[PDB]
From a paper:
While chemical methylation of an amide bond uses a strong base to generate the imidate, OphA, the precursor protein of the fungal peptide macrocycle omphalotin A, self-hypermethylates amides at pH 7 using S-adenosyl methionine (SAM) as cofactor. Omphalotin A derives from the C terminus of the OphA protein, and it is the OphA protein that methylates its own C terminus using S-adenosyl methionine (SAM). The structure of OphA reveals a complex catenane-like arrangement in which the peptide substrate is clamped with its amide nitrogen aligned for nucleophilic attack on the methyl group of SAM. Here, we report the structure of the peptide amide methyltransferase OphA including complexes with cofactor [SAM and S-adenosyl homocysteine (SAH)], cofactor analog, substrate, and product.
Residue numbers in the entry:
A (entry chain A), B (entry chain A): 7 to 386, 398 to 406
Write the structure that this text describes.
Amino acid sequence: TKAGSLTIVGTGIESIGQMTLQALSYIEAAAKVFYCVIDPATEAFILTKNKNCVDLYQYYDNGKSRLNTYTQMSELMVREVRKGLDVVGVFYGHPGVFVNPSHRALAIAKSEGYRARMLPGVSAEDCLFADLCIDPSNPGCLTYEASDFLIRDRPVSIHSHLVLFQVGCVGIADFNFTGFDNNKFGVLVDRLEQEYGAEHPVVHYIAAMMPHQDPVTDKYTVAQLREPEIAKRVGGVSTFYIPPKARKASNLDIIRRLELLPAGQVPDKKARIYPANQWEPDVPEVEPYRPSDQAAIAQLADHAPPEQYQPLATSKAMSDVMTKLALDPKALADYKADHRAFAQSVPDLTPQERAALELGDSWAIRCAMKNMPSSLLDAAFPAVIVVGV
Amino acid sequence: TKAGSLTIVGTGIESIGQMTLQALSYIEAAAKVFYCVIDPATEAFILTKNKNCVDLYQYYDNGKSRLNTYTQMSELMVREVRKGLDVVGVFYGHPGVFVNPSHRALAIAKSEGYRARMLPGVSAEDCLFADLCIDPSNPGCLTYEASDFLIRDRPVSIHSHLVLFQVGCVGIADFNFTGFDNNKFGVLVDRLEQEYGAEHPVVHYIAAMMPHQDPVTDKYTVAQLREPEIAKRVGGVSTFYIPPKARKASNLDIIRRLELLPAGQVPDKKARIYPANQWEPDVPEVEPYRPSDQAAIAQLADHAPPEQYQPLATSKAMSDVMTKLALDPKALADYKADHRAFAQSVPDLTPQERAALELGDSWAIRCAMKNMPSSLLDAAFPAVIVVGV
Ligand SMILES: Nc1ncnc2c1ncn2[C@@H]1O[C@H](C[C@@H](N)CC[C@H](N)C(=O)O)[C@@H](O)[C@H]1O
Ligand SMILES: Nc1ncnc2c1ncn2[C@@H]1O[C@H](C[C@@H](N)CC[C@H](N)C(=O)O)[C@@H](O)[C@H]1O
């Protein structure tokens, strides 16, 4: 193992709070931190967590190709990796979602034989789902960069969600500190009119970046985007959400092959699961408390945990060590280097807990931390599926 | 304002570390916590952070419609909201990504006039981007639930990413504690063959759930998914990634309208930005250090921060309060109720810092925390765009 590693992490969108615990722990552990964030409170927070930080944002410039900036950003990180340092790169949101220099730097580090990993973060699209109250599952999600969407004539589905990033810099490859002169925005609007019609809704979405702010969730018709007062509101942190125009019908062959038949009464294409998408035009009211819902709720009074449910049955020592492995990158490295030596050094573990850590197998650890009922193991593996469409 | 609120949060995918700081803070602040997580270390962690937790997973049962479970899960949360409690629901990953009961509970709470919010988290798709080293931007991303994909004949694009969730329970609406008998998996494979061909790659993806694990990133051909030994590896935490088959050409009309013309030499449709997608079949090697890259790197020696770059210039007191607003939900509520009273109570703030908090405007706060150069304001607003495709 060569000295030197690159770990790229995110900060999420909303200041500080949307950073993951592991992003924070790696920032603290790093020999050197390179960051590219928008809000100053997140920047200030990062600087309190590591004494050796460099702002990558200073490598942008007016009329300077963003591609040249990205090469430089990547090279600054990889240079420090080559010197043998544990380097952390920090990008706002998810660091691999609409981000060039992270993928570049990691690929170079990997190709030169250094440890390289991206830790996922909360993207603007994650925020969009939360704030617009939609689920990519229902009814599928198409996500594009706005210029790419136009230039390569990327397909839309009128029956699925559409999310467009970078709608504030349509056709612009460079940078200006005072913002983009988004003069080709009308080209995007023409495409949206062709695909959806002039009266179809488009949600202008800006996630709150500070904890006390509300998101921008402004619905406009496609036609309204041509109004100069509306178009000028679209900036560098603007994303568009375009809801579906209609519900798609079910395929009879698939209904048959999946054996969803009974008497033929699969629900209608508009027989929606509550709640309906509130952005979709002319969506009918969906009843939250149907007779089936009421009957399910009536069963709560007599509910008991099923015999195959596996209650948590762990110990402070085991919870402590699993927490430490998640929150202390140095402890994790030590454990990964020698499971046995690490496991045997952890105080207060039971024999089963020690053995499970010695092995490292997910099953053994799960087994040490949950009571597995005899009924369960006699029948016949994580299984947590929380969507039913 | 009625007593009672519902805040739904995520834990991310990988045990503990992928929880956001705000998810943790809301879990700690809650009067009651309802959770649905897969790994026991995350469960144990949650139980150390709040004394009043209920496992929602006990409302699944063998042969019990998942829809009935979801109604019950939602109702357990909303009942406590109605009693006037600050309730936190916790779902693994992102709590609104392929999750029924979160959206249900929030919509009901909102309709009855209670405070209701979803906080985004790290989804399995976020993990997929990080672990497979792909960017949804390049070349667009289509995301579907696997049964829905089939039943409603959702379109694929051979030129964009395809991500399929719930590939381990194709056509299954119920639950079994011992896992799904995924007997209709072959129907998914037939669809993938029709769309992509028998020799096209499909990546079986399982993100590591424990900090020491590696992800499953196993490439198979579509044809190989028919092998029983391979099909049985696909379970409840399996996601498929299907890379593009080809590069899409540019639209000449759009090239003209966006004025990307010069002598006509837009890059070829295969003239890729490094790095190439390593999963895509027959991708050529892309040079990381082209002459343009080398020239950009040569400019680093003489680099100075641009005159319009805005250096951080804050104080401990201001950083402390912005951190507190992000990490202390009670402090945030107090600040939101009365900006002036809150701002005037914060020790050690400068006059400008106090005034900025009194107003709450993003501009004023940004202004108090960053030195804005005279050159910047004379020219003519966040602007952090890190992808150039
Ligand atoms: N606060 C925000 N609200 C909505 N969309 C945003 C926000 N910030 C960034 N974006 C979107 O992300 C684009 C910038 C991207 N290069 C970076 C995205 C970032 N890596 C993420 O994870 O979301 C913007 O042009 C917007 O489309
Ligand atoms: N560890 C994992 N690796 C890859 N995919 C996963 C993992 N865990 C869950 N999934 C995907 O998510 C599905 C379950 C969903 N109902 C819940 C997803 C969860 N809310 C998320 O944010 O990803 C599974 O069937 C998989 O498709």
